């Protein structure tokens, strides 16, 4: 025979794969400066508020299961990219 069925939420299988491709190089644990104490853990988040650059990330946010610190994928990756950079002298 042949019959049809309906669909439900919380079943994002393909979608997830997409994001992963974006964070293929992105590390699982980052060592931020403001939270140097511990290394955040890239946690999947729909929306949040970065406590570094004062922005809002999506489908990506460095969360810590110890202090609950959220950050941006890029913000965490980089160290000092606000005004100055790596220079010797
Ligand atoms: Zn940020
Ligand atoms: Zn922490």
Separation of 69 CA from ligand 2 center, angstroms? 6
Separation of 83 CA from ligand 1 center, angstroms? 14
- Tokens at 30, concatenated: 């980052």
Please state, in angstroms and rounded to a whole number, the distance separating the CA atoms of residues 27 and 41: 9
Instruction: Tokens 């809002």: give the residue.
Output: 56
Range 69-74 contact pairs with CB under 8 angstroms and sequence separation of 24 or more: 69/32, 69/34, 69/35, 69/38, 69/40, 70/40, 70/43, 70/45, 71/30, 71/32, 71/35, 71/40, 73/23, 73/26, 73/42
Q: How many domains does the chain have?
A: 1
CA diameter of the chain: 77
Separation of 29 CA from ligand 1 center, angstroms? 16
**Domain assignment of residue 71, given as a range:** 1-89
Residues paired with 62 in a beta bridge: 42
Separation of 69 CA from ligand 1 center, angstroms? 12
Please state, in angstroms and rounded to a whole number, the distance separating the CA atoms of residues 38 and 78: 16
3-state helix, strand, coil in the chain (%, to 5): 15, 10, 75
Separation of 37 CA from ligand 1 center, angstroms? 18
Secondary structure (3-state) at 72: coil
């Amino acid at each position: 025979g042949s019959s049809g069925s309906s669909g439900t939420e919380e079943r994002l299988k393909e979608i997830e794969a997409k994001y992963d491709e974006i964070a293929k190089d992105w590390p699982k644990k980052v060592k931020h400066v403001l939270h140097e104490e511990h290394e955040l853990e890239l946690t999947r988040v729909q929306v949040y508020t970065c406590d570094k650059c004062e922005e809002e990330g999506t489908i990506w946010s460095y969360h810590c299961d110890e202090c609950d610190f959220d950050l941006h994928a890029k913000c965490a990756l980089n160290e000092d990219t606000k005004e100055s950079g790596p220079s010797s002298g």
